[PDB]
């Protein structure tokens, strides 16, 4: 039933095997950053390789705790007073964004017995200066604002500064963390290097990551955590769509039953061009098509692709790398029904996980 997401356990496992290699070679721990991928039908499988989850807030923390188990970590730029009590029940590690936040909740944290951390902003930009180390970032504590006199009760330090990056910028950022915050690392029980590590992308320098993690754990006597999101589900899911109509207007136009605006919003927002199985670039194959959504939106154009044979009503189009940053942020704009969610099991069978309908659209509006 199209449109539908399909997540493939064998492809998830290919990624998880690499992450488990890093765990086994270093003694570090690795958590799923749920903001990238929260498909909890897969949490038990993921939890059989990884150590738990991290969360952006109460809802992700509850989902990780209840559907995966293991360790449940959380970070937020600012916690809500009306949620901190439940957060401290669910989570075993809780990361604060500022000294004001830490001091506000310190008494409750100590009474809960859970492990408190602080997020650091090392001000070492390795992206495009969306970069958490860009000037004016609200994420993490800069050295100039760091309060060593207020570290009683802090057991960990955390940073997250990367996105789809290799080991070298991590190694470089760790060196800056040591230069700036070095005197306060020894007293911690754990350090968390964040996400953005493209660990499962072919060619990633696993050896450099292993060496860096091991050196830090040894030098400071800490447990290191990594919290990748994208790497867990990279190239492990698809979005399957059926062509509904084909028309001619200064070229071939295909109306699909999936919408970029509703079902893969980053395609339009970023923007980026998703891979299509059997699809090429314009002029690469025999037929060029502009693929558009079934919405009333002039701008809901998925992209221009070529195919060796015609697309016609009933043709199936398979978008790739559709597990990450997709289902976690899709919407019902224009009243489009949400795509169904399927799981392709490692034995090859396919299970319907979730099918949506009118009530899912209606209940958001009043």
């Amino acid at each position: 039933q199209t449109p539908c997401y399909v997540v493939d356990e064998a492809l998830l496992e290919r990624n998880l095997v690499i992450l488990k290699q890093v765990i086994d070679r270093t003694g570090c721990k690795i958590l799923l950053a749920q903001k990238a991928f929260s498909m909890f039908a897969c949490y038990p499988l993921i939890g059989s390789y990884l150590n738990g989850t991290t969360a952006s807030g109460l809802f992700e923390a509850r989902l990780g705790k209840e559907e995966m188990g293991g360790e449940t970590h959380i970070f937020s730029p600012a916690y809500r007073e009306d949620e901190i009590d439940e957060i401290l029940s669910l989570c075993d590690h809780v990361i604060f964004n500022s000294f004001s936040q830490w001091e506000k909740y310190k008494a409750k944290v100590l009474a809960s017995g859970k492990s408190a951390g602080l997020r650091l902003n090392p001000e070492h930009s390795t992206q495009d200066h969306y970069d958490p180390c860009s000037p004016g970032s609200r994420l993490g504590i800069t050295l100039k604002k760091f309060r060593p006199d207020l570290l009683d009760g802090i057991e960990g330090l955390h940073f997250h500064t990367l996105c789809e990056q290799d080991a070298a910028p991590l190694v470089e950022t760790v060196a800056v963390v040591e230069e700036k915050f070095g005197p306060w690392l020894s007293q911690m029980k754990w350090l968390n290097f964040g996400g953005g590590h493209h660990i499962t992308r072919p060619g990633y320098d696993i050896d450099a990551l292993v060496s860096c993690v091991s050196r830090v754990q040894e030098r400071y006597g800490v447990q290191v955590y990594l919290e990748p999101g994208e790497a867990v589900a990279l190239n492990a899911g698809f979005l399957v769509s059926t062509v509904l109509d084909v028309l001619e207007n200064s070229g071939n136009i295909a109306v699909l039953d999936t919408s970029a605006a509703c079902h893969m919003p980053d395609v339009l927002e970023m923007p980026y061009r998703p891979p299509i199985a059997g699809g090429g670039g314009l002029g690469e194959k025999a037929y060029d098509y502009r693929l558009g959504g079934p919405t009333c939106l002039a701008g809901d154009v998925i992209g221009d692709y070529s195919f060796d044979e015609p697309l016609s009503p009933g043709s199936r189009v398979v978008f790739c790398d559709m597990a990450i940053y997709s289902m976690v942020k899709n919407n019902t704009f224009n009243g489009m029904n949400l795509p169904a969610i399927y799981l392709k099991k490692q034995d090859g069978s396919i299970q319907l996980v979730r099918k949506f309908g009118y009530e899912d659209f209606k209940t958001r509006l009043s």
Binding site: A36, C163, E164, H198, R201, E230, L234, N235, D266, M270, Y272, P274, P275, I276, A277, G278, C320, D321, I324, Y325
Partner: peptide, 7 residues
């Protein structure tokens, strides 16, 4: 994100 998709 979305920089490394493959068929």
């Amino acid at each position: 994100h979305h920089s490394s998709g493959l068929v």
